[model samples]
Target chain A: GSHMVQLVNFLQSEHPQTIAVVLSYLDPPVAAQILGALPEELQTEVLKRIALLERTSPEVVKEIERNLEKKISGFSRTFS
Target chain B: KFSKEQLRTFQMIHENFGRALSTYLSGRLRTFVDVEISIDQLTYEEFIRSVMIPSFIVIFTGDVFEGSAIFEMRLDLFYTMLDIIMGGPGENPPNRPPTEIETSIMRKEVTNMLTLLAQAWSDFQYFIPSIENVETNPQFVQIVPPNEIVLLVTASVSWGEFTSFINVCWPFSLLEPLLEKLSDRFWM
Candidate 1:
């Protein structure tokens, strides 16, 4: 939960699609808890995108994660 | 007035609603219910004038939204569903007002529909809808000024050979506060 608190701060400015893609890669229950902490608008919007999610290219996924990691500044945790 | 993007978001949300409701109806009525959806932006006067007299109208309000919205369907379809639920063939009874017992039974069904409608809106915002009133006369209902813009969502529902329409009218005034959230950037 402490880790998620930090993650939420990083996620606040990201696009909802990016947030949804990131959450879909996480354990759903973990994502669910994180979802509860986000803005209500983002919470509902992310769930809708996740529900309609389909396969994305691995290179694109890696690229997204790279950008997010840079956005996190000092978190230094690898999503993959 | 709604921009195209706002209308697109509305379309996507209601399509999900249509799927959820059709599935629910199929399971409950033990028959496949096909629902075709359409949405439009128009004036309240235009919509109210389209209503037939002695129609079944449900005025509802969402916990999160400021004002009321409307849901209505043909009384024939209502009676058909009512009859099927009461263990009879799904046939439209004679053209007449429903009895008090019938009205009570319909209240339960309307409540279920409103619940489903609320869930359909969860993607845009979590909405818990409460039925404010049910009126048989369309002329008696007026939640907004005649010139006010409204979004009308009509679902043409079919089962067997019977086809009817159920509509939800959303006043722009009611949804003005959330219009920003309906954009592609925010709606996702």
Candidate 2:
């Protein structure tokens, strides 16, 4: 729950397409909670993108992983 | 392009909106009114071109979003509705543009109709919508980009001998954020 809150808070202003990528990897129930926490219309946008999603190439997957990791580290660094 | 399931979600929302509208009008007008709904997706240019000249169009924006949406009815339909509201037979409109007095009267009713529209959307999001303009000429209306994709929700409304269509135009940009609310497991 704590992790979900931070992730949801972090994702608030991110593009729906990027959110779709992250959601593609999360467990359904966990993803659903994160989705629910978003602003009303954003929830709809993200869900739609997820529905239309296709498989990502390995390079794109690695890039997303690095991107999110960097974001999280930066966020935590600011706190420290 | 919106997927089939996404489009279905739009249909579902309007179906419920139509049901509420029929009930509201039936009681408000003290007459039996029926509404049948269907939806289609097309560019804004196609939609604006399709509307008849000198039509009654209500352009409104929602507080929950950036862009606007449209609710349009033919003049005949607006007049018929006006007649019914004024305790007349609800038929045989004069086939002309409404007078200032008539427009003022219909404006109040249009506000009520939009209130119902907002309610229909409340289950998914609490939308505060207000009329930006009420137009008679399609040429003067330009809420969205001309080539932008839009979903049109048309309701064929009937009151005894009178029948006309009411169309709600939603631009993809306006609906983009709320598109997911129209889908499967999210609805479940």
Candidate 3:
């Protein structure tokens, strides 16, 4: 819960394009809440930025995935 | 099977559960609760083997989530917490097992702890949980098949001079249906 809330808090001030890049990965309800929480003046630009945002946070995803993979594989060795 | 993204998401969700629980305990204790749970995914067999003896194991069922979930807490920590709750100094606690009657007194406390768990999960979505039974041995509290995988969240609790682990294991049976809605980021 805090992750997305915190993510949006930091990105709210950045250019909408910057914030939108991250928001694109988030689901609709979450995206809506984050946009809703932003100052009314910044909401439209943020959505516009999300459209302009082409690339996603693959690198961020990769790091999280790698850590989880390590935990899963580590536990697998002990499962037997 | 779940994607790395999904596992990462579950970790974050449970991480929040642990954090909220920590604060909740602190408020109840009138002192900071320096404990946080970490999410671990593993087979049921692995989970059974990891738990050491001299602990409190409570088997519970949720109103909506079928099957059962096990809540395991180390007796040392629980004993200490109980002592503190009764306004005892809390520093002196019996590390050894207590009589059945002495232990039964803690049932309400355990049930309350499970209630906190259900409350923590309400943030994700409501599924009011209840305690079906509280047992010390795992043999009688079988929740799923031996080979089934489970999502376990455990924390190391500390107060005064005692520290021990408490764990809650969610069997595959209870979570499979929930995970089927993964695209919505169930844990996220």
Candidate 4:
């Protein structure tokens, strides 16, 4: 249920730039969920930085949508 | 033992992180992806199958029971992530196209995020860190070698809009040190 420690290590070891590609591409809500998993103080810090970004770039959105669709569909079929 | 206040602190920390990340992700995707992407609200069952299940399987390559330590991602939350990624309304049903690459990427990102989150929790002394070592570690005995650690990446590109999440799953036993560290921190 707790993941604060992991987040710090990731931030320290993998700079936001290296992970930014993935971070920038994430759907805001999904990004939020991962962020939400962290402690509050860190969440604020992350959001503050995200706010400065110009936009969520079209390429990242397309990539996210494409991936989500496939994963949801496959999941539905397997169960239902 | 943690005081009720401390536990509450942990819970608040958890809730705040979830809310903040959700809001941020929604805003970012909506702005970046020309297409409208909203957070999805999912039923309990759907959340487990789509979010938790796949995430665990792809990332850790471990079964549900084995990875129960952090198996708290509710079904509603999963749908919430799906909704935002798919440009659906917060009330829309969970339905979207699928792709292996996108799923793989989502899994990787989720794993990365979780790993980071776990480390944070450890720093706070919530629990010890648990590593998933396929070799030597008997907990991962059932998992096949070479593919002991797998990264699942998922993505979708429609008129240049992308939304995805990553999930990393590994044997909790391997991360025992990390877990121990967290426990120690909490007691300290």
Candidate 5:
């Protein structure tokens, strides 16, 4: 809930495939927010990548989580 | 009758709303609020029979739907919401019928729900729907026929420890046109 808008902004700058990979962990609300803000051309491509994605590595998932958490914490420190 | 593809749209729509709603409410209430929409395919008659007695049933008019549909939740969510708005432990009320005053307390939350519904629904479906009225009793509300097949989108609200169903009944005929055109080829 707290990090969704930030996550959406963060994902906006990443590759379409990266965004699609991250979206699976997101709830409908965050996914919709991220998807809605993305460019029209990117939207279909992301969905396509999400569809074609059969498996994702646990190490990669852990790395993404670590980075997002680190980034969210950094925001807390600066915004505080 | 609506097809499975349309049913997917129904589920997808409310699932988005559930997330948006819980995110908004949790921040405002300063508490743990979780929302999940239950994807359901049922006849209007089946849903009428599924209602838990003494629920907070409100009837609303949505322009896109072109009909009055029921938006409802149990008193558990109502009371918990009251706690979030007012100040208390927010426990269960007596299991009997809810009072008129208690039911009215839900007006603000219900209104917020409608606005969020319109916003989130628009993101996917591209039309804004509005709620004009709220009624307490389904018996008093004659919006749709009993046998009319409808799309039932229910959101499960887990507020703190309390759990309740925030139910919305969608009239099939009103939504038929939109549902009929649902596809990768159709949606923008």
Candidate 6:
């Protein structure tokens, strides 16, 4: 729940387009994690965009993990 | 019915024709080509669902075997061919409609290639000597022009690739008996 809160907070601050583009490469599992973390309304909006992107490639999950880690690290540094 | 050996011969003929067509196109066009021709056994249900049903839609205007063949080309190949003929830098090319002259030239080029291909087919004896459009029954209701047939060929070069589909009508009365003969050989 804590992690979910953090993810939602991060998504809220980031540009939705950036998040959407980044999410293009993500697998269903990672997308599920992010969706779970988001507020219900935001989750719906993001999922709509994801579905519009059509079939996804296998590389998306790794790309999402890398991008997410960078985002989290950047967020933590800002706090420090 | 075609014997097992006869079936093998038919398969070999089909494969050889496919290979010959691919080779001829690639050599002349300086493009990469892949030809897939299948003559495998089909169950009645499978045939109805996969072949007969879709073909009816595709050949709505005329007979399915008229001058009929399907050709699929990659998008990249189309762009490249357009560029080469039009004298362009061949990078991030724009889409423009072909001029009347260009269209005629392309049509002639395709016709010539097909003629050569048909000649190669004659070597296998499976193809009859004369080419005819069998789809020309006046009583036969058609959505498209009776003479029109379909060709689906994909062509790719260094610049790009595209698929071209053409439908044609040809005479096939004599060829039918040969095809039946060949089919019998295949089943035996």
Q: Best TM-score goes to which candidate?
A: 1
TM-score of 4: 0.32
- The sequence of per-residue lDDT tens digits that candidate 6 reaches over residues B1-188 is 22455456545655555666667556544556565545543322222222221121112111223333322222234334433333222233223333323233334444454554455456544232232222212233233343332222222222135443222222233235455655557544
Between the candidate structures 3 and 4, which one is better when assessed by lDDT?
Answer: 3
> Model 1: which residue pairs collide?
none
DockQ-based CAPRI category assigned to the predicted complex of candidate 6: incorrect
**What digit string (tens of lDDT, one per residue) describes model 4 on residues B1-188?**
22333444444444443443444444533533221212222222333335432222322322212342222222233344443443333232233322343343344444544444454344453433343321212233343333222221122212233344422222324334433554447555
Please name the candidate that would achieve the greatest DockQ relative to the true structure: 4
Ten-residue region with minimum lDDT total, candidate 6 chain B: B53-62
> What are the per-residue Cα lDDT tens digits for candidate 1 across B1-188?
88876888789888777888788777666789998889999999999989877677889997787989999977878777754554344433446655443565677677888788788888667877888888888878988889999999998888887888889999999888888555644556
**Each candidate: what lDDT?**
0.75, 0.74, 0.64, 0.37, 0.65, 0.40
Instruction: Report iRMS values in order.
Output: 22.0, 24.0, 23.9, 10.0, 21.2, 17.8
- lDDT by residue (A1-46, candidate 3, tens digit) is 6555555555554334434544565677877888888987768766
**Residue by residue across B21-90, what tens digits does model 3's lDDT show?**
7776676566887776778789898898776665678888877776889988877676666544433334
Report per-candidate DockQ: 0.01, 0.01, 0.01, 0.04, 0.01, 0.01
TM-score of each: 0.67, 0.65, 0.62, 0.32, 0.61, 0.35
- When 2 and 5 are scored with TM-score, the better candidate is 2
Model 3 DockQ, alpha carbons vs. true complex? 0.01
lDDT of 6 by residue, A1-80 (tens): 56545666666543333345444544557657776666776566656655554433233334345556765543232112
Clashes of 2: 2
- Cα lDDT tens digits for candidate 2, B1-188: 67787776677778989998999778766778899998999999999999988888889987787788899988887876654444334435555566444565677777888888788778777787788888888988988789888989999888777788889998889776776564535674
The TM-score-based order of candidates, best leading, equals: 1, 2, 3, 5, 6, 4
Under CAPRI classification, how is model 1 graded?
incorrect
What range of 10 consecutive residues in model 3 chain A has the weakest lDDT sum? Answer: A71-80
Q: Where does candidate 6 stray beyond 4 Å?
A: A1-80, B1-10, B28-79, B86-99, B124-175, B182-188
